[PDB]
Ligand binder design. Sequence first.
Ligand SMILES: [Cl-]
Ligand SMILES: [Cl-]
Ligand SMILES: [Cl-]
Ligand SMILES: [Cl-]
Length: 341
Amino acid sequence: QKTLHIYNWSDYIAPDTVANFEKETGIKVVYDVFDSNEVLEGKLMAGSTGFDLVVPSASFLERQLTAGVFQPLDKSKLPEWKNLDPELLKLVAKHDPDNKFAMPYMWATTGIGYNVDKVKAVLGENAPVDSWDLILKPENLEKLKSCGVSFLDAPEEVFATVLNYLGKDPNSTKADDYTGPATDLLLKLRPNIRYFHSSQYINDLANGDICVAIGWAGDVWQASNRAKEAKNGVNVSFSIPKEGAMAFFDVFAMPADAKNKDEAYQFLNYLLRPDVVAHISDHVFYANANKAATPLVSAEVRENPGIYPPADVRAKLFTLKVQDPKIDRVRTRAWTKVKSG
Ligand SMILES: [Cl-]
Ligand SMILES: [Cl-]
Ligand SMILES: [Cl-]
Ligand SMILES: [Cl-]
């Protein structure tokens, strides 16, 4: 009789996941969608979210835990918790100690989505698609300028990527690293960037309006799938460059003021079933954090090194650390200057 309120990212669930859950349990689910961590973090901090389950990034959940906005998950009501990958739990544990608040849902990387034919036409057959040189080196970006360049509107991810590319600590705590070399490189690349956006690059890659983009893996693969299913001749690929890339973990969490927690636990345990979350990965092209589900996901997604990256690629991935207010202020203030001109 009661209702379950879920707040998740867009295109972050299979089309029939909710319907199958309702038929199994008899619980009516109302499903709303967001497209930014700052939007979710806004509703979480501004007051009551009105939801029973939310899906923030692990790095943002750590900041939200300091405000007490979430309720610790009763593991006794999640028996299928064992299906989760223990190594991914340890990575999320850096933001959520002992995994008390967050259930890992999906994870991917921040890399380069690009049009294969357009990039090879501009930079040759030997285009450095395996390196951040493709998009972070000015001479490459100046020639790709004509076919469209877009960056994420995510200063924390872009600065960490630039710092790692420049040989610095990706989570550097020195403000001069952000205002100095990181900003200098970004200003050299700025005149060649068409726009800064965290979702528009998907359709623009699919229809061919842009040729290269900093984007999240599953978003680029969804853009690639829309181009193939549209039969428009657009070939979109994704690359985790050799210099390393930022990894993120999207997690389910329960706000402290959630109304129907019992129904929420039923939905979390439903997502912990290997067949349920494997079917989601088949449709959203994101690697799930369920170790038992990995053999169940389709080969077209499982064997993609841009979705389930191999061990030698995972060893070069880094994660975001939460910065103090001085670095967050410096990093955000410098990002505003870059976007202007
Ligand atoms: Cl949706
Ligand atoms: Cl975000
Ligand atoms: Cl030339
Ligand atoms: Cl079972």
